[model samples]
Target: SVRYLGRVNPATKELSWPGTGVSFAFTGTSATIGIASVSGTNSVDLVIDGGEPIVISDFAGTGISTPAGLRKGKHTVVLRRRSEPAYGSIFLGNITTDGHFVPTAPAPKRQIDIIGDSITVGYGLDGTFPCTNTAALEDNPKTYGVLAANALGADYSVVAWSGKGLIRNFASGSPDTSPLMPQLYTRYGANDADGSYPFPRSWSPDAVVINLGTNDFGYLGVRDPIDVAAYTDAMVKFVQDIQKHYPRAHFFLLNSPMLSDTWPTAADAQKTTQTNAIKNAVSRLGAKAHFVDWPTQGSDVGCDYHPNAATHAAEGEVLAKAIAAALGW
Candidate 1:
């Protein structure tokens, strides 16, 4: 089974974690989830036998429900949490299935990890509400990170927050707000007061892609004063921390799909400023890092100007291609 970012106590069959990308593999004809989501709403995407994903709302309380019923044969099911962690946390007491369990197969050789903001979380991809509505609108599997993983047959983990930045929050002043990605990157249970980000020292990914700073530069007509020098250092340290665990991973510094030369006015200057910060970090660290620019895209935004489903898919295609070209995947 895949424990993307969850903790499981085999002794008592207790599982608890937040974040939409938490998932696992199962082999069975029928599967049930025992979950308790503490706020707003969380979602589940059940993908069986390589089929398209089905989305379902997950609410609060500890109870068991048969979320799926399948044919009488062994089938592979990849179940994912599809909402922002802020919406709530799910405590998975158990996964009950009728058939004998089949262990999850090993992940593909190509693995990826992403650190980003709202766009990376698939915020509002459903096109149903404004980003102001709730974090419930997020669907991680539909986002570029997981979509690219699907396209590449790779496993991934997404560590992203809705409105966070590397150095400062979107439009928030210097020393902006509590728990910027760099601060929370090493912590766990972002939605919980006390939960350390638990990771096995051996866990590693082949590539790590970071799509941040959209908030740092601000959004929805707000801009934060950026200390390019400080941001450059922070970015390098962030990647360095990740590599301490996955030393061989390739790093990609991604720019925003929303901020480009075509729109966001002063495109060239803005884009260059963002790119140069990362470039400076990469040069200073002298690591396996590459800067990637999002293709020309605009106006297909969902709530709060986040990319919609189609744009997300487009981003997936572009990023997957970029990964293949750079990593020889």
Candidate 2:
């Protein structure tokens, strides 16, 4: 028996979205993990106890060999899907251990739900710029949401996809009618069946952190500008929907570190426009909703100018402190 850490399809045991995986404890020297790449080649991050994350890349449909030299004692292992659904989804299967599995510790009382795009998914965190192998570089375990949850002593579920936005996706100079984050948030998996996720009644969050809009306001196409009114309206409705499920959870609306005072175009900086829109969205939600600002990235250290591990660490620290103060946790 294991605990599902993030959103997973129980019927299929498929991990499609970033941060979706499993955790369990056992009394053994080694353990074999059964998993398969359903969509294509994928990678996963394995954490033994609370050690550093080990990236296991190109994991195909086969049982992963046990790590070398684990002592014969009680140990906990956490496996998190590192790749996004766009690359491929993974199927989690049985866990074969030399010794019997043991009951794992209870999950933390504090729970956080993170919703957003590539940054929230930890894209390019492990690689430098001009990344040729995106799947191998994306490490969801190192993302700000997960790191912040850890700092705050909370368990978290991430509902994110690269290039996804609340209203519009990151443009590609072509008409993009892809499903947005709001639509994806309700599903079991990003690319799975079209239905609501079977969120256990007991799985309520203490806080919901939202970091989005870098895509919606950034222009890569020759289309009409982002409609401020429409975006604000959508933000209001989105928070409302989440409230229906987690009425007691506080909302933390965030501005991305990736956004700048002169980006996508100097005249139409996303920092001013998108940030204001987010602030407006919070105002509509009342006291339960608050705005959190990420310090502007001094420099990019990852692929395509995305944040690297160090950047994520700093951002996560900032977010964790904000959550602590807001919720007094």
Candidate 3:
């Protein structure tokens, strides 16, 4: 089950509810309950028996928990929060059962693994605007990954870290020390720490999309074409390693939306070089490796130079189309 933490405004007591599907058995420990969609001055706190109120912390986000095992049945789940405080937010996502019920057994659907930086992680953007302090941390299902998964009707896992790169981005200088290709193979560090990224083993994806280099460009602090070329080479090696592990999966190297210019040497050209290197490396093994050309999103004034939600949605559309064509789905 997905657990989320979010905040509420003290004065107005208004909170935003995320969308939900299926009936969830909720356990009101360290979390609050509320209705979805109805925000502003009309919301109500989700209480058990209309009396046992769930306390929502101001500024500090509260975690909402659901029962561990929910039997198969038809039911509806609702979110209700207070309307007086004016602004509040909650974190939430979907949970799936191990086996399917009724009409069929759980079948393995296509899985897409996404690895990248902030854009893929849904940083700083939420479902609603005039966002409360708590809403800032809410994970919007409209993120690129969620959008793509919804469009393709597939399962997906994201292995991403903000300020990270294929080799080395602004986070660090050593290519070997960077959390790029290695994080997919091993698990170390804290949950949100650099080394704690989940390994790409829980589920094998039919397609793997890698979006790096943007942070690398920012971190390098260099404008020389030769320097960028060398950095791109290191990125190529990172792609090669991923191909080695998932040889049959269609690997797509994504170019950045923020840096799309191909001046003396366009960013797309650099992406091409890296893509070609992976293609050549995988060709030896008869692996399918390709490049996805994304439209430039330009500079975002949002948190930490990351793309806002709208740009992310546009990018998701581009990625979904490319994946559909590549996989012939």
Candidate 4:
């Protein structure tokens, strides 16, 4: 039978199974264990209580298949290797298992909603350093959102998409002038069939973070100031709509690392302009809104100029300090 072990920091923690040892434990019957990657020639067995252990699938370079059938109440789930391997490793993204049913009811701690592109998603950096491909790809919990949440000890959700931008870019094969903002309000259907961006009606957040404008600089063609201003205006409207729904939520406009390199003047000017627009919109709606300057620790080339894990952690630290100052935390 699997024994229950206490919760640890899922970001840096790993489970090691010897010949006869349980890696981690959870107390619940109905639960979901997210396995991102499985390494080596050996397969890991996921055992529920005293039931037979099930062998999970290997990493397919994208994401992992989630395991279901967790019962209600406290139950123990264990991960162990069927056979010892010279080199074996596995990664778990997160577990939405059955155990303590903590309702998603609004709490005193401020809720932060992050909407952006790949940088917000922590693209290149594996949840852990040293790059272990044995773990699942989509099991990365070390994204900027999680890092920021850990820093502030606040609950947050990410509405970010890789290769997505505020204004469509020809370089990324995006449609001309098609704003990605509207898709975030509804269930994102056509692009990502999984409905990843189910927002607006889903839940309201106390603070919202918008990090975009990278692809809007037009990487493939000559820069056009007029088009850039038009796109920036569109982004302003998007924030207004967000304020309409979340009247009290603090809105933040963020510039991207890539944007500075492409159009330094346009990017800097847009920051000031967008901040004013957000402040104005919030004032009209009787809400508090502010803008956070983009951290200077811009980009890393490892994953297409996206910040590495360390940079993400640093950004989280900066964001935490800002939040603390704003909320008096």
Candidate 5:
């Protein structure tokens, strides 16, 4: 049987959540996946019978077929999106298992929602190349947020994009016309121009993580920056909106590891400045929200300056422990 781990929009027939995973367990002679909108060089992680996953790329158009006649007893397969939203969107219409299409359950009880930027998106996570590469190298499942979720035995919905922020975007800063994370939160994938979905209608998370605020003050992106005061106000409002939608979910505001270093002038200083601001904002809300300071890691290897796989492992452990302690998971 085959399963889609994310929301599928009827109007678009597209995989609504780019971060959603796919699973299949079947007895088959061959497996075929109907793949639409290949999104250029984007790929998915395919693991057969819990074997070493293979990266199958150059998917030109509508479908991809695995070699026929595998060792055919009852075998299992897992297909997950290998890159971030930066790679693009996917429309998975059919998965021919050569057997019955087994149904799958919804996200588990401990569902966590993450609102973040490139870091949350796992931009440039594939280290085979350099950080200079985007799209193909991105993979949200490898990020700390997802790792943490799995460690805590929870499911997650990631609402994140490259260069996006809570209030302002990365290099675009305050003046950029692109929608911020807050604006994109209620929509599906942020790029779904016509369709709109509210949080309450979708599945609510048991916990929520907000790992934003790096691009605003970073040397490369901070051109027309929003002051800490404005950020705090915006953040307060952001948290308030999520709270209004998910009343039962516990919120975790992460002062992320990106840009916490003393590499450039006030860039380092704003690290705590941002942390303090987030804390102040959370105080205005009810007791359901808590602040978590993500540790700093200088040895990042994701393509350009982004965190690599090892960095993700270290950071993921930190977040997993924090979530474990906070939720008693």
Candidate 6:
């Protein structure tokens, strides 16, 4: 009667990834969704029968009381994780309805698997730059990858964390020693290591989209020059590991739109190096893999210079078209 999305821990019935959610149909006027935030600040959006989203926030434990009134018939409700994994992990419990639970529509057959950072996590897209209310601003469902999935009528799984790069993480103009994407990619949650989620056999993606390297090449922090050879090798191995899990899925590697020559810091050489590494990895990956160069954004509307909703929309359309054309959908 319920369909779960993203990476949900089977043993604990908890989901920590951004964009993970549950949907179910019920023949009732009122319902209480049982969900609890285990740690950190978190929030969810309750979308009733695809209507406007209702924000649910400020809870540490126990059930969520739904809004009053209904059409007095079967209602399909979708509970989506609005905050990123950095905010916290949540547990999904039973749904108590006035009537009985009904089966909801199955998800679309086409699938896309996304590997990225804050850009892919939709960081602060709901707010303008210089914003700080991360718990209220970050929305995974509004990200480009999810928008593209919706455009292609496909189900998607997003594994993303803010400021995480393929080779290094964001640092405060100092030597970087944070965990890299390759290290975090294998874990169920960004902050938790106990619940390791092995990829599900029943799920498969038609395309694997990767948008990384902005932090690695950006001038946010001062570090030694990236080892192009090591970075390229690591990317190749990353793609290869994912390929073993989804051999039939095509790879769409991308350069970040946030990186541009016009930026004040001017890291052209660094951007070029990262771009070449990604392209080289694609070439080594063969025919099924392709490198996508995202044009630099003309504006910065989101928090900390992240892409805004408009930018994500345009990129989503472009990505959707590319995927459709490549797969001949």
TM for every model, in the order presented, reads 0.83, 0.95, 0.57, 0.58, 0.88, 0.93
Winning model by TM-score: 2
For model 6, how does the per-residue alpha-carbon lDDT over 213-260 read when each residue is reduced to its tens digit?
Answer: 887765443656556797788889889988888999999998888876
TM-score of 5: 0.88
- 183-205 per-residue lDDT for model 5 (tens digits): 77777544675337544455777
Clash number for candidate 2: 0
Q: What are the candidates' C-alpha RMSDs?
A: 3.7, 1.6, 10.8, 10.9, 2.8, 2.0
Task: Give me the candidate number with maximum lDDT.
Answer: 2
- Put down candidate 3 lDDT per residue, 1-329, tens digits, no spaces: 32221122222222322221122332222222332323222222333322343333332222333233434443223233321111323323333333321222233378777776655655545434333323333343445655776588766655555556665554343433544534532432112334333343645677887777666655333433324545556655666666666666887777776553463245446445544444444454343666666666655424554556787788778778878887888
Clashing pairs in 5: 1-102, 83-138, 84-138, 130-303, 131-303, 131-304, 301-308, 302-308
lDDT at residue 48 of model 1 (Cα atoms): 70
Evaluate model 4: give its lDDT.
Answer: 0.50
Measured with C-alpha atoms, the lDDT of residue 319 in candidate 2 is: 89
lDDT ranking, high to low: 2, 6, 5, 1, 4, 3
| Model 6: pairs clashing at backbone N, Cα or C within 3 Å | none
- The TM-score obtained by model 3 is 0.57
Clashes of each: 0, 0, 22, 15, 8, 0
- C-alpha local distance difference test of each model: 0.67, 0.84, 0.48, 0.50, 0.70, 0.79
Off by over 4 Å in 3: 1-73, 76-108, 127-140, 171-178, 188-202, 219-226, 260-287, 298-301
Could you tell me how far off, in angstroms, the CA of residue 219 lies in candidate 5 after the best superposition?
6.0
In model 6, the runs with Cα more than 4 Å from the true position are 173-176, 219-221, 264-267
lDDT for predicted candidate 6 compared with the true structure: 0.79
Residue-by-residue lDDT tens digits, candidate 2, 1-329: 78887888788888888888888888989887887436665788888977887788766457665579888988889888887888877787777889988998888999999999989988888887778547888888888888999899998889998899999998877667889999898898787765568667768999999998878877745667789899899998999998888988899888878888776677787787778888898898899999988866876678877788998998899889989998997
